Design a protein around this ligand. Structure first.
Ligand SMILES: *[C@@H]1O[C@H](CO)[C@@H](O[C@@H]2O[C@H](CO)[C@@H](O)[C@H](O)[C@H]2NC(C)=O)[C@H](O)[C@H]1NC(C)=O
Lengths: 92, 50, 49, 85
């Protein structure tokens, strides 16, 4: 019963990073290793293991909250048309 | 291509939809990504139409 | 609607260069405000159907 | 008189026209209710339990899902040895 507005489609779209001290010599190796991991699909395996909720996004079609605006609008349209016809008969 | 032209000194910056990956990063340095997107498949709507 | 090997478009440069840090910072700043969103609206999100 | 006809319109000068348009309304509302219930009894189907061992519920224990095996068996050894389980 919780959903996000669309999916993060008009926002800052940044990413999580590994903070390091400025001018650190670990930066080159760490970035290269992270890029290798992302390209090899190990990161995708980690997302599968950890960042996976109930089934999938669970579209589930209409879980509840039935909408029938067309039906009630047509209902009122027919009732008004009938009453107008009765008024027209009264006119004659 | 663009990688060869940049590495040979013919250019000083590649302003283009250049994908960041480990193969290229070993020789050049990328900036922080200005776009986030993946690979996908393009097809058509039905054989001719619905 | 499928996606695989999610990656990013960045700006390539040579090895250690004076423009690297400021290019990265300018891209991050443009992401923080709506400039990249404006570019997406102008060039990518303008569709005809 | 025509009062019972009204009740029966669903099944059986301008008063007849009004009765006809009302019968049309009755048919459209019955069809609407039929379509609503048909979509109702089709869409509701709790598969919940996924057949997989890769189901996230099994990997993440919770109060609403209780699962176990026989103590001191081969399954116990199998789940003990693998560090990712
Ligand atoms: C990158 O941006 C920084 C912004 O801080 C520039 O550093 C300043 O450069 C101006 C040049 O006129 C100097 O007057 C300032 O004293 C500098 N400040 C600091 C804190 O360094 C830097 O020059 C830029 N680099 C390039 C290559 O454009």
């Amino acid at each position: 019963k919780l959903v996000t507005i669309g999916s993060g489609k008009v926002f800052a779209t940044t990413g999580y990073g590994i903070a390091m001290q400025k001018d650190s010599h670990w930066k080159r190796a760490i970035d290269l290793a992270l890029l290798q991991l992302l390209g090899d699909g190990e990161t995708q395996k980690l997302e599968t293991v950890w960042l996976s909720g109930i089934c999938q996004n669970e579209k589930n079609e209409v879980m509840s909250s039935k909408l029938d605006i067309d039906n009630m609008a047509g209902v009122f349209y027919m009732l008004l048309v009938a009453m107008g016809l009765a008024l027209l008969v009264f006119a004659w | 291509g663009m990688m060869g032209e940049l590495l040979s000194g013919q250019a000083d910056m590649i302003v283009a939809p250049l994908t960041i990956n480990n193969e290229r990063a070993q020789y050049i340095e990328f900036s922080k990504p200005f776009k986030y997107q993946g690979l996908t498949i393009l097809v058509k709507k039905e054989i001719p139409r619905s | 609607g499928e996606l695989f090997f999610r990656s990013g478009f960045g700006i390539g440069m040579r090895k250690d260069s004076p423009w690297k840090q400021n290019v990265s910072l300018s891209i991050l700043k443009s992401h923080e405000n709506g400039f990249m969103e404006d570019l997406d609206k102008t060039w990518v999100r303008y569709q005809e159907c | 008189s025509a009062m019972w006809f009204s009740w029966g319109v669903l099944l059986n000068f301008s008063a007849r026209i009004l009765g006809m348009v009302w019968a049309g309304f009755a048919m459209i509302i019955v069809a609407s209710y039929t379509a609503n219930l048909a979509a109702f009894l089709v869409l509701d189907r709790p598969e919940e339990r996924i057949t997989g061992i890769n189901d996230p519920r099994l990997r993440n224990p919770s109060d609403k899902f209780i699962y176990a095996t026989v103590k001191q068996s081969s399954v116990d050894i199998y789940f003990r040895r693998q560090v990712e389980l």
